[PDB]
Amino acid sequence: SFVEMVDNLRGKSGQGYYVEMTVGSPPQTLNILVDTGSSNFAVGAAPHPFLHRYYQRQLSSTYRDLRKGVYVPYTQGKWEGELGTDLVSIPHGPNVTVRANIAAITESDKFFINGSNWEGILGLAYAEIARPDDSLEPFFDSLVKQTHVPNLFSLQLCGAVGGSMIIGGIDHSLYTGSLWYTPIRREWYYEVIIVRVEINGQDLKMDCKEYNYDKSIVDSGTTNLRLPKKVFEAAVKSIKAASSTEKFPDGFWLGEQLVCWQAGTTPWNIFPVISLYLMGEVTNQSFRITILPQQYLRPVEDVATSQDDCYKFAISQSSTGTVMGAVIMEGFYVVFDRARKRIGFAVSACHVHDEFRTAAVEGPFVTLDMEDCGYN
Numbered sequence: 297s298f299v300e301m302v303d304n305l306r307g308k309s310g311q312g313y314y315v316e317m318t319v320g321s322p323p324q325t326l327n328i329l330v331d332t333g334s335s336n337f338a339v340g341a342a343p344h345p346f347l348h349r350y351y352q353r354q355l356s357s358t359y360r361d362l363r364k365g366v367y368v369p370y371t372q373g374k375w376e377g378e379l380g381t382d383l384v385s386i387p388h389g390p391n392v393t394v395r396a397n398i399a400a401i402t403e404s405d406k407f408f409i410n411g412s413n414w415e416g417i418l419g420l421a422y423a424e425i426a427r428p429d430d431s432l433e434p435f436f437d438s439l440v441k442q443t444h445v446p447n448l449f450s451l452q453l454c455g456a457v458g459g460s461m462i463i464g465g466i467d468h469s470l471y472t473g474s475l476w477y478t479p480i481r482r483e484w485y486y487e488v489i490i491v492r493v494e495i496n497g498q499d500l501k502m503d504c505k506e507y508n509y510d511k512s513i514v515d516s517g518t519t520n521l522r523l524p525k526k527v528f529e530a531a532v533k534s535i536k537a538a539s540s541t542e543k544f545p546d547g548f549w550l551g552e553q554l555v556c557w558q559a560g561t562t563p564w565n566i567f568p569v570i571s572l573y574l575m576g577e578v579t580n581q582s583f584r585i586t587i588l589p590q591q592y593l594r595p596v597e598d599v600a601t602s603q604d605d606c607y608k609f610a611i612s613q614s615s616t617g618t619v620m621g622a623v624i625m626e627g628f629y630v631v632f633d634r635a636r637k638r639i640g641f642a643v644s645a646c647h648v649h650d651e652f653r654t655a656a657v658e659g660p661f662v663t664l665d666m667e668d669c670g671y672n
């Protein structure tokens with residue numbers, strides 16, 4: 297039964313997608329950010345100006361202190377805390393309880409968001425990137441070990457937000473058309489390989505290893521599509537050329553300035569689609585996912601800006617590889633098939649579209665080139 301797991305995610309634009317979890321005995325309810333880009337389960341466990349509730353260890357009779365400190369520095373934001381174990385459940389997920397590692401966050405810097413409505417983070421990637429080191433078993437590994445739940449999960453993130461995390465199986469009600477799979481190159485992040493990028497159907501014509509310098513990952517905790525410097529600059533130039541009819545603030549393309557139009561007058565049609573071709577499961581085959589401006593120009597929720605419709609450019613520069621974040625994942629049904637070491641993409645029920653264009657997953661595409669596109 298996955299019907300009860302449907303629509304178990306909530307969120308605000310730019311502030312991630314969260315699921316309700318409980319920790320401790322008796323259970324304490326907390327909202328937890330779903331993040332495929334990390335591997336630590338961590339919850340606020342001390343007062344913070346931006347937390348309206350937190351994990352109170354002294355009130356759980358099943359809490360065990362591991363007497364070990366832990367620190368996680370993200371690209372933006374960091375926290376410090378104390379490791380322990382306790383019982384964890386997902387009320388609107390699988391009907392199981394597991395004992396898992398939990399980092400009790402005691403200090404933090406730019407981690408919690410004012411008004412985000414979540415109080416913790418669930419890192420769904422592999423032990424390789426867990427802190428303090430890879431010996432700290434991640435939540436999903438514990439869940440599979442301790443229960444009969446199949447080793448996979450899927451995410452349907454929906455734009456303005458909500459969505460579904462389905463654990464243990466595939467919900468065919470959440471997508472249409474074909475599911476296309478790209479291999480997980482290595483299990484640490486969910487690392488994948490991009491073999492080609494097009495803007496409105498025009499090839500960026502780079503050596504395809506540049507697209508994966510120095511890795512490409514699928515990362516639900518990150519809002520933006522992040523691209524390696526060289527690829528970012530070229531994509532921005534290509535996108536600028538398409539939307540040349542309208543001029544925008546210099547800081548817009550830097551993600552430092554919003555662009556606003558009168559309510560309901562956003563000129564979506566002047567902006568190009570972006571296609572990412574992902575390595576297929578068969579030699580020299582790929583498939584493409586196509587992203588509309590409704591995805592990469594993300595609406596800002598702030599009430600202060602609500603007189604018009606304002607958007608932030610949700611593509612940004614990366615020094616640590618490509619990050620296919622939420623704006624890439626939104627509208628797609630994304631299957632993290634850990635058992636078969638692959639990630640699947642299909643058009644979801646909440647996929648982005650207007651009358652002329654639609655987000656799509658299409659294939660196969662074939663290349664004569666014999667160069668692998670993985671970096672290093």
Ligand SMILES: CC(C)(C)c1cccc(CN[C@H]2CS(=O)(=O)C[C@@H](Cc3ccc4[nH]cc(CC(F)F)c4c3)[C@@H]2O)c1
Nearest residue numbers: 310311312333334369370371372373407425517518519
């Ligand atoms: C493995 C680890 C050491 C955690 C690490 C270090 C650098 C980069 C990564 C890749 N994954 C990262 C990329 S990121 O830092 O942009 C967002 C991060 C999750 C994260 C962390 C704090 C956060 N605070 C607010 C948000 C909401 C977000 F949507 F803006 C948020 C999301 C991912 O988890 C992992």
